[PDB]
Design a protein around this ligand. Structure first.
Ligand SMILES: Nc1ncnc2c1ncn2[C@@H]1O[C@H](COS(=O)(=O)NC(=O)[C@@H](N)CCC(=O)O)[C@@H](O)[C@H]1O
Ligand SMILES: [Cl-]
Ligand SMILES: [Mg+2]
Length: 468
RNA sequence: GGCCCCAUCGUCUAGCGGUUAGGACGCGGCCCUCUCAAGGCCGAAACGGGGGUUCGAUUCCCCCUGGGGUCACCA
């Protein structure tokens, strides 16, 4: 059938590139009624960042993905952490040794640096060590690595499902280290052994790996295994076209979550990076994505990750895809994180409704609608100016307001409209300064809905401090 | 620098021999209107260069340019 996987490396924050690739693997597996695996590639102890693994697993679930086999969901071919499979790689590295497909190299890091300076890259000198002496020197505990014994001279063909066949000259393929002197494997060894053992048949990873692929094709041969299909995706980029990175862009998924980006939108956005719906539609669900997926509709150029369009899409979701109630729920954490409180669910909901079209991130709601939840709100210089200029007519309106019994948006509007008429003045000349008195701002939702919201007492109690 | 991949508006893209080269973000204008948004309408904005193939190239082939990847006991 079809078995795909995402093989994150726990070395930092949950990378957006990781989500991007995981999405295409998830779609392809489901579209074929296959399996989607998660394998944690923690083989480099120097770059290992404790706490990374949980964070990446949480981020994929947050985005809406699900996996069938993995670290925390079990599976027939585990463990799903390479660090727990160490003995396994040893066994296969030694098997290559016997098949004559690899050799032991004893050079120190320093000698290798020197060889690289003279000949540029390892020259395979350890191949000239009699196999018996190599084995003997190993039993003595002498530190060493196992390298892939590339067939020289020759040519190695890689088949990319998206670009056709690409020919590599074995002279372009180094005798890569398979097993490190600390007994840990290199990405190359672990990847093939594990992809094979876990049944993967469709390898989808970014294009940065295409040139390493020939090494993998040769490993599958050395073991006498069948190679899976390869699909190399384009690399997400910084605005300056360089491979996306933390110094020039936001690459951390936990950053997007903390900024109030809806996971559904971030997901939707990531799908338009190298893929597009038949009918050009750009707002769609994860389920529609799976259903429409097709390699024929994948673009191969490296897409710039545009934060502005992401904000736009996030706002589109907030106002057209989610219900008023879903938005009101997702806003709470951000209200709490801002130290604001809401009286009740009804109040919150109405507040969110009034602001729905005025914020693109959940974090912006507490910011722009602060005056609706606390009395501790800023007053813009522009709002203060408009307040003083209209102070006189607000004083003449105050008594009319205190007299008003039906505190409804409809009633209030008819009241103020009439007040502006009799005073021979545009509603705006009385509506603008009242807005500043109530909100401390000049950019808010409709006055009547804002006036009604708090209730007669609350609204007037604030209008009074303004006239004071 | 060697090797490999890629190439339509500023950005994400549709196109898959013949189109007024379409859509989206963003940008400008207009309508809406009590502010700001949201929404609607209009607009400016692209096929990197040179060869070919073909009646006919954005599209098919070659070269150059640009961008990216890799040449690590990193992934
Ligand atoms: N800027 C970018 N744009 C788009 N995709 C990007 C990316 N950066 C990383 N990726 C892709 O995300 C997945 C995991 O990245 S990663 O944590 O560094 N780990 C690894 O690359 C290796 N553990 C796995 C390689 C493989 O899948 O065979 C891998 O599929 C990797 O290719
Ligand atoms: Cl990074
Ligand atoms: Mg145009």
């Amino acid at each position: 059938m079809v078995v795909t996987r995402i093989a994150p490396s726990p070395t930092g924050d949950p990378h957006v590139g990781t989500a991007y690739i995981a999405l295409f693997n998830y779609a392809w597996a489901r579209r074929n009624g296959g399996r989607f695996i998660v394998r944690i590639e923690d083989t480099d102890r120097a770059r290992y960042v404790p706490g990374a693994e949980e964070r990446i697993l949480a981020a994929l679930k947050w985005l809406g993905l699900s996996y069938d086999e993995g670290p925390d969901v079990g599976g027939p071919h585990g463990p799903y952490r390479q660090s727990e499979r160490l003995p396994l790689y040893q066994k296969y590295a030694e098997e290559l040794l016997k098949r004559g497909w690899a050799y032991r190299a004893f050079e120190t890091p320093e000698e290798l640096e020197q060889i690289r300076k003279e000949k540029g890259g390892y020259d395979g000198r350890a191949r000239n060590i009699p196999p018996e002496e190599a084995e003997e020197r190993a039993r003595r505990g002498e530190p060493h690595v196992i390298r892939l014994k590339v067939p020289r001279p020759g040519t190695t063909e890689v088949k990319d499902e998206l670009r056709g066949v690409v020919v590599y000259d074995n002279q372009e393929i180094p005798d890569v280290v398979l097993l490190k002197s600390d007994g840990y494997p290199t990405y190359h060894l672990a990847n093939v052994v594990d992809d094979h053992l876990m049944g993967v048949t469709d390898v989808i990873r970014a294009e940065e790996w295409l040139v390493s692929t020939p090494i993998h094709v040769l490993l599958y041969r050395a073991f006498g295994w069948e190679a899976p299909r390869f699909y190399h995706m384009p690399l997400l980029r910084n605005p300056d076209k360089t491979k996306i990175s933390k110094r020039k862009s936001h690459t951390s998924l936990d950053w997007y979550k903390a900024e109030g980006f809806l996971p559904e939108a971030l997901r939707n956005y990531l799908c338009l990076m190298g893929f597009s719906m038949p009918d050009g539609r750009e707002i769609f669900t994860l389920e529609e994505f799976i259903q429409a997926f097709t390699w024929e509709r994948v673009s191969l150029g490296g897409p710039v990750f545009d934060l502005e369009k992401l904000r736009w899409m996030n706002g589109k979701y907030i106002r057209e895809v989610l219900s008023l109630e879903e938005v009101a729920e997702r806003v709470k954490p951000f209200l709490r994180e801002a130290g604001l409180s809401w009286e009740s669910e009804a109040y919150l909901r109405r507040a969110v409704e009034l602001m729905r079209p005025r914020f693109d991130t959940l974090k912006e709601f507490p910011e722009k609608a602060r005056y609706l939840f606390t009395e501790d709100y800023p007053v813009s210089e522009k709002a203060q100016r408009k307040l003083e200029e209209g102070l006189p007519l607000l004083k003449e309106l105050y008594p009319r307001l205190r007299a008003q019994e039906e505190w409804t948006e409809a009633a209030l509007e008819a009241l103020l409209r009439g007040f502006a008429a009799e005073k021979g003045v545009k509603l705006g000349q009385v509506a603008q300064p009242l807005r500043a008195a109530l909100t401390g701002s000049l950019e808010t939702p409709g006055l009547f809905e804002i006036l009604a919201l708090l209730g007669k007492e609350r609204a007037l109690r604030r209008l009074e401090r303004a006239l004071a």
